[PDB]
Structure 1
């Protein structure tokens, strides 16, 4: 269903455009240290806040990369931007990386709320899973992915406290070892 098109659109109109130029952008910043790879958050609840420091204050915005621009579909200098965050753990800087949510999941969340979209609110989790799975299969085979990015899919427990998002990211970041 809908997650398949959105996963493909996310690759085609974003990942395949930005991944081949990412390492080069990261070097340039590091002169003027940031881990290689784009870390893409995939919350299966589709809860995508716009400010990441509100998902977890241990994720703390540092800076932006150098913008990448390109002429796209009649738009001159369409801008692709990405943000660099520091991951904190017990008050210590434990990691630095380019981190963001996968925006199509916010697009599934919204769809589920608009009547005329014929997308039922209880189909969210199944579409989110389909989106993650489609996207992994795309990136296994993707020439533009060689390292390059890491998917961080997760599901919060029902419905207690704990869950650290920073710790979730820190786990994958440490793996890169």
Structure 2
């Protein structure tokens, strides 16, 4: 399936590369505002709505800083760069938490495939594959040599805004301190 390939791709070509070094990059950051959480928070919107900017999703999520770049040779690209961003989460206009946060990039591929005629990929296919991506990725991480990351999958109906993405991420950050 489309999702099977994307989940393996995201694990092999990204998470397996950045998660073993994440704990250390946060140290180089932390002590060198506000301790940043230790885990990479990965947002999995099942509708595959992935904006370039998180503040677009929720104005209470604001970019704060970049972690130091991780660079390395991969597939003939000398000094490929992987970068991650730290965001503050505001509550009543003030900072309530900070964490390394991003959307799962393969969900942009599912979205764009649903939009390109030649991909032969419907909106129903997109939802089914977004689900299968999440499940497949989770099953991989469950025995992947999880501790450095937290996956948050969620669905939001289209005509409906009872949803605060910043509040949900804050709930998770608070539970982890515990």
- Quickly name the TM-score band, shorter chain normalised: over 0.9
Q: Would you say how many aligned residue pairs link Structure 1 and Structure 2?
A: 175
4+ runs of 1 displaced by more than 3 Å? none
Task: Provide the C-alpha distance between the structure 2 equivalents of 1:158 and 1:84, rounded to a whole number of angstroms.
Answer: 28
Task: For residue 161 of structure 2, give the secondary structure of its aligned residue in structure 1.
Answer: coil
How far did 1:112 drift?
Answer: 1.1
5+ long unaligned stretches in structure 2: none
**Shift of residue 92, structure 1, vs aligned partner:** 2.3
Task: Tell me, in whole angstroms, the C-alpha distance in 2 between the residues paired with 1:157 and 1:171.
Answer: 21
Q: d(CA) in 2 for partners of 1:84 and 1:126?
A: 31
Deviations 1:42-101 (A, max 9, x none): 000000001011111100100000000000101110000000000111122111100000
Match of 1:59 in 2: 61
Alpha-carbon distance, 1:147 to partner: 1.4
Quote the residue 1:4 is aligned against. 4
Normalised TM-score (structure 2): 0.95
Q: What is the CA distance between 1:158 and its match in structure 2?
A: 4.8
Distance 1:78 1:158 in 2: 37
Counterpart position of 2:110: 108
In structure 1, what is the Cα distance between the partners aligned to 2:171 and 2:128? Answer: 25
Q: Which moved more, 1:87-96 or 1:97-106?
A: 87-96
Instruction: Tell me by how many angstroms 1:157 deviates.
Output: 3.3
Instruction: Spell out, residue by residue over 1:16-39, the C-alpha distance to the aligned partner (whole angstroms, 9 max, x if none).
Output: 000000000000001221110000
CA-to-aligned-CA distance 1:140-159 (integer Å, 9 cap, x gap): 0010xx51000010011352
